[PDB]
Homo-oligomer: A and B are copies of this chain.
Amino acid sequence: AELVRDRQELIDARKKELKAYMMMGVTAIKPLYDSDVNGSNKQAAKEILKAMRFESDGYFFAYDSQGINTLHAIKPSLEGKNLYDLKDENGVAVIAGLIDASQKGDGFLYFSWHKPTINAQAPKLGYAEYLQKWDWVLGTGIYIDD
């Protein structure tokens, strides 16, 4: 109950951080998002969000509501691929889970994903917000392998 308490504490602190980082990404592209005319500014917003980091493993991705990747900071070759049916190594439907978390839930999802600093799968806590004008489920995450 005691070492479990310290873990919940660490998790909750990370969830607060994730909400802040998400706010930074959303507000960084706000001038573009607000002034957009039929997707005119999406490319410019992608270039900003794909450059942003809060640490080496701290980056943005986005998917549309059909699970098609619209931007990926780490692996831009995912862009335009439909990953709706994608499962992690534990059978978590990652993309569908993030789309649903962001639209119908609290934004959070536990899953495993490539971790940049070790180039291998690791457990992650993702956080996503839905940007309806562009149909982007914009997400980031913290790795919990610690």
Contacts and interface: CB of A to CB of B under 8 A. Distances in A.
Contact of A17 (B17, B23, B25, B28): B17
B23 A51 contact: no
Contacts of A58: 20
Interface string A42-86: 000001100111110010000000000000000000000000000
Contacts of A23: 53-55
Contacts of A11: none
A144 interface: no
Given A17-B17, A20-B21, A27 B55 contact: no
20 contacts: A13-B13, A17-B17, A17-B20, A20-B58, A23-B54, A24-B24, A24-B25, A24-B52, A24-B53, A24-B54, A27-B51, A27-B52, A27-B53, A28-B28, A28-B48, A30-B51, A31-B47, A31-B48, A31-B51, A48-B48
Interface of A: 13, 17, 20-21, 23-25, 27-28, 30-31, 47-48, 51-55, 58
